[PDB]
Ligand binder design. Structure first.
Ligand code: MOO
Length: 131
């Protein structure tokens, strides 16, 4: 299963919002300008695909979601991926989809530590993967 990451785990330094966005944008070939835009759940779904290909129902992800009920659908896809891979993290979905900075920044700081603990260096085509 996945390597879990806890508050007590030894991890890299937290990233600035600028450096976190750079990671997201460069890794996934996106152009987010705000951490709040992670409220859509789609980037997290793709990072899960990148970590564990086949863990996520990529075809069901709404990459161009603009409505909160769509953000929730994307996070349920992510939650199913976490369950499949034995990730013991509860996603505060109700908070994230509202677009508030602190909630979204807190979760992406954890998720980047999770990612770094699990990523194997595989090549990945995030554009080809969004079809
Ligand atoms: O000054 Mo920050 O580390 O982007 O919240």
């Amino acid at each position: 299963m996945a390597v879990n990451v806890y508050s007590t785990s030894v991890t890299s330094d937290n990233l600035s919002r600028h450096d976190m966005l750079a990671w997201i944008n460069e890794s996934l070939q996106l152009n987010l300008t705000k951490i709040e835009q992670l409220c859509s759940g789609a980037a997290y779904c793709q990072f899960m695909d990148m970590l564990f290909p086949g863990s996520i129902a990529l075809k069901k992800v709404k990459f161009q979601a603009k409505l909160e009920h769509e953000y929730i659908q994307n996070f349920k896809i992510l939650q199913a991926g976490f369950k499949r891979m034995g990730v013991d993290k509860i996603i505060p979905v109700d908070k994230l989809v509202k677009g508030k900075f602190q909630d979204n920044f807190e979760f992406v700081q954890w998720f980047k530590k999770f990612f770094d603990a699990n990523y194997d260096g595989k090549d990945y085509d995030p554009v080809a993967a969004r079809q």
